[PDB]
Design a protein around this ligand. Structure first.
Ligand SMILES: Cc1cc2nc3c(=O)[nH]c(=O)nc-3n(C[C@H](O)[C@H](O)[C@H](O)COP(=O)(O)O)c2cc1C
Ligand SMILES: Cc1cc2nc3c(=O)[nH]c(=O)nc-3n(C[C@H](O)[C@H](O)[C@H](O)COP(=O)(O)O)c2cc1C
Ligand code: NA
Lengths: 126, 127
């Protein structure tokens, strides 16, 4: 397993703006397989400590078709909390609106960067 | 490196699989603005050290409509080389097929990898 961003595309012309494309990065990041993701709204990543104020801000951004980047607490299938730096970009394909989402697991990024930084320090100590 | 990923969508039903969407991460990474990008084939990112074998891997996957990932040398507008960890997937939107590509600049990681691999060869030679 290596760091990879999640990428989804949703179709807002369909009931509840479901995910119609998801990459393998998202599968690896969240612990859900493609068949458990396609057709669902992305809110299934939310959980106990997801800030409702930021969920509100996302809702408003989507309504207003404004790009938004927000750090939000999300949850893997197995219940593990991760901080998600989420970017959502409204866009158009054949004169219809879609949303592209990019998820960045900053918790994992921090952990992995620490491992490398510590190993490099250990080497110089020799 | 701490930079955003590029995302592009292309329409393979149109001649030469042109870009129909590109994000700001891609604009940032490549040095091209969206008006310079839209309607073009993504091969404009290629140059001297772009390995034909990796271009082959991409071309074959697209022909087969199958996912592909490669690490490929690409070039910014100013001519500087970057290493692109590139993922391309087919996808379906409203009963029509597209490709979605995700570009990850791994230039710095590649620099470290080479130096660490050299160091390992060197320590082993001292064994
Ligand atoms: C493209 C896209 C990607 C999204 N990705 C996430 C995500 O990674 N995590 C999350 O908590 N919400 C994500 N959302 C936000 C939710 O899908 C939803 O819009 C939000 O919870 C507000 O709507 P609601 O009040 O009906 O839940 C995404 C939305 C879109 C359109
Ligand atoms: C969605 C999509 C994204 C692509 N992104 C890149 C890229 O970032 N870098 C690159 O060198 N080629 C990229 N390509 C591959 C080229 O567009 C092209 O398919 C490849 O060079 C093989 O075709 P050719 O031999 O006609 O050039 C992408 C292709 C598609 C469909
Ligand atoms: Na070529």
């Amino acid at each position: 397993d290596h760091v990879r961003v999640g990428v989804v595309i949703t179709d807002p012309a369909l009931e509840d703006n479901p995910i119609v494309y998801v990459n393998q990065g998202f599968v690896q990041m969240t612990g859900y397989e493609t068949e458990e993701i396609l057709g669902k709204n992305c809110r299934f990543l939310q959980g106990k400590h997801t800030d409702p104020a930021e969920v509100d801000n996302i809702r408003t951004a989507l309504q207003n078709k404004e790009p938004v980047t927000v750090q939000i607490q999300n949850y893997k299938k197995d219940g593990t909390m991760f901080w998600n730096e989420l970017n959502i970009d409204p866009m158009e394909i054949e004169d219809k609106t879609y949303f592209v989402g990019i998820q960045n697991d900053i918790t994992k990024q921090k952990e992995y960067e620490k491992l490398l930084e510590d190993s490099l320090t250990e080497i110089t100590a020799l």
